[PDB]
Every structure is written in structure tokens, then in C-alpha cells.
Amino acid sequence: EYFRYRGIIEGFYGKPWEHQERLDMFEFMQANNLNAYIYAPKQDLYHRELWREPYKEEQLQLFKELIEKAGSCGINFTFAISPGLSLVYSSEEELETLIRKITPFLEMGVHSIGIFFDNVPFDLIHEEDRNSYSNLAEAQADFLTRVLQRLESTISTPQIIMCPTFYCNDPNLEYLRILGQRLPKNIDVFWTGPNVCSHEITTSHMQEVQKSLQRPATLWDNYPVNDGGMMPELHIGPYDHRDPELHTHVVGIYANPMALPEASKLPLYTFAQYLNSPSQYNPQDSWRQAVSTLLGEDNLSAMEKFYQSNTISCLEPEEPAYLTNLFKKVQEDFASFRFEQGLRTLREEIISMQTTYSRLSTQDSKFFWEIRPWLEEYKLWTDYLDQAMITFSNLFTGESLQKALQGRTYLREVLKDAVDFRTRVCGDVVRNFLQQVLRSTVSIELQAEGKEWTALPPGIVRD
Amino acid sequence: VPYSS
Ligand SMILES: *[C@@H]1O[C@H](CO)[C@@H](O)[C@H](O)[C@H]1NC(C)=O
């Protein structure tokens, strides 16, 4: 009603989804009224580098099973291909090769074809294309026009969706204006927003894109994807910061999910609710209903708590806000003779985190198997805060100098080990707090050695 | 930093 295409694009780098996960995702999609899937995993060689090579029968049979499942689930299956690393745009033989590659899909009932040119060189690679075209946009437009014209003479109502080589940031770029002029209007055009993974997508922004393209764009929305340098981040937070009236300027939205499919269901649930009724969408309401349905009511408050340490994404790029504020508050308490209050706050927070871990660790489902590395490092950060508690308590009492010194040793050791953490759970917020415990307790080492009388800042003797 | 960058 609001969006014609309400989709998932499997378009990420990293380990492609398993055949069974795709089939399962199609059931999740139907449950939440998502009606469109694009096959485009970057690490499938036959999608991209070896785009000329046809799929073997074993693979084509799996595609047939996917296509039939999609149809039974009310999902339009789109097969995408990415030829732009080596395509000779002007070559008649190359067109024939692409048509040969997609023919098995045409014969299995797929009428929607993706042809993507993201992440390729910004200028023409081949001399024969430089002789035929003034620039990339012209070559691509002519190629896509010719592919469409061929498909109209092959099947009934073919549809092409293309991804431009410039797919984010400046909507008034010359390339985009050439593409809007020269692409036939019914070829759909992808766009990811102001950034690759966009913080916000506004109506104003998509209005501009619409003008240059001379058509409503289709959004390739890069959330919850956590590929490449984002792999350490667990993107489980709600879909957010997409204007309630984007539907006016956008024909549809495909979400690029994580290589963790079960974990993706949490934000994808919220994404689907936004698409269903964007004017009544509340991300916190949606996220809580998502957690209840998918993971169970009894894990809700534990998930709420655990999510506070997994906020980092394009949607919430800052260091985790709750813990950032809390440790600043605790440090002010210590700096203002409110020792009991600061220690209490730290104590209560540790208990909350232990309870949260213990609760979620008890659950056996696939979701909790996928997010286990984040749970493990979450517990570790909690163990370290517990030792910070001991260190501060013994600092304020003073004999307990031994327990304080011992805590400094422990913290020094684990802060070094924490350099090797694989995830971005708790950001660097717990790290920086623990490092400051180390800095805040320098003078007890000086006191231990009777060096206070001659040690100068930063806490050394010199001449 | 995304893989696409
Ligand atoms: C570039 O960005 C994302 C995130 O790294 C990646 O998954 C995707 O395949 C690339 N292309 C587009 C159009 O987003």
C-alpha cells in the first residue's frame, strides 16, 4: 500500500546465506508482509567475477527450489548479476553472454533481473568502449537499454533494476543526470542514501535523487549489514531515521541484511513494520514486539539491557550512550565526595549485566548461537568492571592496599588482552573507564614504595 | 567502515 517493493536484498560481502536459511527467511518474509527478494551475494563468484560462466545443474536446481518457495510465499524473486568489473559495454558478444547466463532464470519464471554496477572503476576500462561512449553513464545506459529491448522480445513484462556506479552521496552528479535522461523510465534505479550505510534518509534527499533520475528511486538500504570493517558490530537495533513520507518519493526499499540471518530477523522485523505503516512506526515499540515474538517475552528486559552495549551502527554511530553517561556520572560522584553513590551505581550496573548475560546464555535457539561472540565478550567486560569495583572500594577504605594493587595488576593484564577482542560490544566505553581506573590509582604504587615525597607528575622520579 | 567503503 505504501511501498510496492518491500524487500530483502542478499547483497552483502562475506559468507552467503545457506540454502535452508533462504527458504526459512522466505517464511519470515511472508509472516511480515515482505514481498521481494534479490539474489546478489558478492562472494558467489558466478554473480560477479565469473559472471560469464553459467551455473551448473546442481546450483540451478537449488535456484528452482528458491524460486518456487518465493512464489509460494508471495515473494517476487529477482536474480541479479554484476558484470561491471570486466564487461565490454559496446560488445554485442557480451550482451549475448549475459542473456545466456540469465536464460535458465527466465525459463524458471523469473521476470525481474538485477544488473548492478556498484564498486567498479569510475571510468571505462576498455578502449572499444572509450571509442563508442563519452562516459560510464552513456555506456551503461546503452547496455541496459539493449538488454531490456532483448528481454521484451523474449518474455512477457520483463523488469530490470540497476545499481549505478555512483549510488550514494551527491544526488546531482552529472553521471546520475545522464543516467536519468538515457535509461528507459521503467528500468528501476538503486540508491543507498547520503552514505553507503546512511544515518538518515529524508524526503528532501530522495526528492533530489528523483529529479536527477527522472523517476522514483528504489532504496538499497544498507542496514542491518555488518560486512567488511563493520563485522565487529552486532547490528540488532531497530530500523530508524527513515522519514515517514519517503514512500511519496521511493518506489520501494530493499534491506541489505547481515551474513547472520537469524540475528537479522530482529531489525528486519522492525523494518517490515515501518514499511507497513510508516506514519505510526515507533522503533522502540517495534523492537520490543520483535523481541517478544522472535525470542520470547521473558527475554525482553535482558535484551533491552544487552542492546544498550550493541547500539553502534550507521543509525547510532556514537559510543554507547547509556554507559558513556553512567561512567561520567560515577566519576563525578568519586570527584565530589559521593563515594557511596558511585560505588552503588557501579555495583547495581554489574549485577544488571550479570543477570542479563545469565538470562540470555540460558537460551538455546539459533539467534543466541549467532550472537554468542558478543555475549562472551559482554561477560568479559562485566568481569573486568567487577575488578574495577574491588579496586575503587579498597582505594576509598584506605590493610587493603594489597587488594587495590592486585586489582591494578589484573586490570593492566585484561586491558592488554582486550586489544584482541573480536567484537565492538560496549564500544570502547568500558575500556576507557577501566584505563582511567589504572590512571586514577597510580599514587598507591608510589605510596607502596614510599616514593610520594619525591615523585613528580605524571608519577615518576627524575633528574 | 563498510567493505564497499
Ligand atoms: C557496498 O556497501 C555495502 C556495505 O559494505 C555492501 O554490502 C554492498 O554490497 C555494496 N554495494 C552497495 C550498492 O551497497
Author numbering:
A (entry chain A): 2 to 399, 410 to 474
B (entry chain P): 1 to 5
Authors' own words:
In contrast, modification of cytoplasmic proteins with a single O-linked N-acetylglucosamine (O-GlcNAc)4 is a regulatory post-translational modification that is dependent on a single O-GlcNAc-transferase (OGT), which transfers the O-GlcNAc moiety onto target proteins, and O-GlcNAcase (OGA), which can reverse this process. We identified the products of genes Tter_2822 (hereafter Ttogt) and Tter_0116 (hereafter Ttoga) as putative OGT and OGA orthologues, respectively.
Previous work has shown that mutation of the CpOGA catalytic acid Asp298 to asparagine (Asp120 in TtOGA) results in loss of activity, but the enzyme retains the ability to bind to substrates. TtOGA possessing an equivalent mutation (D120N) was utilized to trap a complex of TtOGA with a glycopeptide derived from the validated hTab1 glycosylation site (VPYgSSAQ). Synchrotron diffraction data were collected to 2.06 Å, and the structure was solved by molecular replacement. The TtOGA structure reveals a classic (β/α)8 barrel (TIM barrel) at the N terminus and a C-terminal helical bundle domain resembling those found in other bacterial OGA homologues. The TtOGA catalytic domain is similar to that of CpOGA and OgOGA (r.m.s.d. = 1.3 Å for 228 Cα atoms and 1.4 Å for 233 Cα atoms, respectively). In TtOGA, the active site residues involved in this mechanism are conserved: the catalytic acid (Asp120 in TtOGA) protonates the glycosidic bond, a neighboring aspartic acid (Asp119 in TtOGA) stabilizes the conformation of the 2-acetamido group, and the developing positive charge on the oxazolinium intermediate and an aspartic acid side chain (Asp228 in TtOGA) hydrogen bonds O4 and O6, stabilizing the formation of the transition state. The TtOGA C-terminal helical bundle domain, which has been proposed to play a role in recognition of the protein component of the substrates, comprises five helices (α11–α15) that are connected to the GH84 domain with two shorter helices (α9 and α10). Given the relatively better conservation between TtOGA and hOGA at the substrate binding groove, the TtOGA·hTab1-O-GlcNAc complex may provide an alternative or more accurate model to study hOGA-substrate interactions. The structural data further confirm the high level of structural conservation between TtOGA and CpOGA, and sequence alignments suggest that, in terms of loop structure and the peptide binding groove, TtOGA is a better structural model for hOGA.
